[PDB]
Design a protein around this ligand. Structure first.
Ligand SMILES: Cc1cc2nc3c(=O)[nH]c(=O)nc-3n(C[C@H](O)[C@H](O)[C@H](O)COP(=O)(O)OP(=O)(O)OC[C@H]3O[C@@H](n4cnc5c(N)ncnc54)[C@H](O)[C@@H]3O)c2cc1C
Length: 413
């Protein structure tokens, strides 16, 4: 019966970040991470990997190289959560108790919920930037595109980084004009939602881009079946239930339906929908006071992005400490998240907003414009910030920079 003071489930973005932070509060010997995967990935890179601008190798590092020093990695898989006995079970038939539990198991990918997938990925002309086993196929399909439909999908489930399914689309259309095939290309975005983005300031910006480059996007249209050998795709019309259409594709990028992790779906910590039932502001579990959640696995009503994980860590950091002093949490999480919408091989519309779906930009200029500066930040600066700052516990969002940037524009204006 092993036991730790701070037990963190998941060794991904939120898990490694919280373990680094908790390594400073209690001892590094008082912290443990449960995670089966041997590679750790900065998944925001996979957008440009499938676009052909970066290598997949540079998006991953050995999990052992991102474990905070002195913290014991438990290379295993979480099997059961028993918060009424302050205990969890792992797939190595082990039972480890905690004093506080931090749940950071991310989101789950459900390619199987589409009929032809994952079987159809063995065939050419299809890929997905969301799985490491398929993001490289997206770039290959992009090069070997010669003539036909370029179709990009968005599922009928909650997703992580809701902008990614269209980023690859704009980069693909940009690649077609660059290589002389836009005249031979028919770009289509069949999304399950009824708007191109959740905040109008950037949805207006994307709408101008869609109309300028002659892109077709069909709202309330969900992919349900892939026929990879025949190069066909089946879409359900969510606005007219029962109405389906079969469309032949030359390149298909599917965004898989997603769900809470399987172990969390029925677990006693779960929402009615399967997400970790935390509080909007403290990120502390609503029923079990010694349980906390962060990232895609929880029911925080904001976009499940890595930027949100950074902002949540600083809030969660203070929440656990004020709890460890038996006081009451005061600092609230504003719902901050960012979605670096890559519109081309040198442009990014960096969207930033809060719980109220209202803009909250870090920089003094207008970020709803395609800007090269923001592309350089996302492409070259942020990967450095992720490995060396965030995962070390020295990054919790740009809030302290939004302050001085808007204090600097006080001297000016
Ligand atoms: C293609 C793509 C592009 C993206 N681009 C951006 C972007 O530009 N900006 C942005 O902010 N975000 C972006 N994101 C989102 C970002 O990658 C995630 O939101 C972020 O990693 C969330 O961190 P997390 O720890 O909650 O999830 P993860 O980093 O995925 O952590 C989950 C971890 O839990 C582990 N785990 C799963 N099940 C179990 C289990 N049963 N037991 C134990 N461990 C388990 C997994 O192995 C994994 O290591 C993108 C995502 C994708 C897929």
């Amino acid at each position: 019966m092993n036991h730790y003071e701070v037990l963190v489930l998941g060794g991904g973005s939120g898990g490694i970040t919280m373990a680094a932070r908790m390594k400073r509060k209690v001892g590094a010997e008082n912290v443990a991470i449960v995670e089966p995967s041997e590679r750790h990935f900065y998944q925001p890179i996979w957008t440009l990997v499938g676009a052909g601008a970066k290598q997949l190798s540079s998006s991953g590092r050995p999990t052992a190289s991102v474990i905070p020093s002195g913290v014991e990695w438990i290379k295993a898989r979480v099997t059961e959560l028993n918060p009424d006995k302050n205990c969890i079970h792992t797939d190595d038939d082990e039972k480890i108790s905690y004093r506080y539990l931090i749940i950071a198991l991310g989101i789950q990918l459900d390619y199987e919920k589409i009929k032809g997938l994952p079987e159809g990925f063995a065939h050419p002309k299809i890929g997905s930037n969301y799985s490491v086993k398929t993001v490289e196929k997206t770039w290959k399909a992009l090069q070997d595109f010669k003539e036909g439909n370029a179709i990009f999908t968005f599922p009928n489930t909650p997703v992580k980084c809701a902008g990614a399914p269209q980023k690859i689309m704009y980069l693909s259309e940009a690649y077609f004009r660059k290589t002389g095939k836009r005249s031979k290309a028919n770009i289509i975005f069949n999304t399950s939602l009824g708007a191109i983005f959740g905040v109008k300031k950037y949805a207006d910006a994307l709408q101008e881009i869609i109309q300028e480059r002659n892109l077709t996007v069909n709202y309330k249209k969900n992919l349900i079946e892939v026929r990879a050998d025949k190069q066909e795709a089946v879409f359900e019309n969510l606005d007219k239930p029962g109405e389906t259409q079969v469309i032949s594709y030359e390149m298909l990028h599917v965004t898989p339906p997603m769900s809470p992790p399987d172990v969390l779906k029925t677990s006693p910590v779960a929402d009615a929908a399967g997400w970790v039932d935390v509080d909007k502001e403290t990120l502390q579990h609503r029923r079990y006071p010694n349980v906390f959640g962060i990232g895609d696995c929880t029911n925080l009503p904001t976009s499940k992005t890595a930027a949100a994980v950074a902002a949540q860590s600083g809030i969660l950091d203070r929440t656990i400490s004020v709890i460890m002093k038996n006081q009451t949490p005061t600092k609230k999480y504003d719902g901050y998240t960012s979605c670096p919408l890559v519109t081309g091989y040198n442009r990014v519309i960096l969207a930033e907003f809060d719980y109220k779906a209202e803009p909250l930009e870090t920089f003094p200029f207008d970020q709803s414009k395609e800007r090269l500066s923001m592309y350089l930040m996302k492409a070259d600066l942020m990967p450095f910030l992720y490995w060396n700052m965030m995962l070390r516990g020295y990054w919790g969002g740009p809030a302290f920079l939004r302050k001085l940037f808007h204090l600097g524009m006080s001297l000016e204006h």
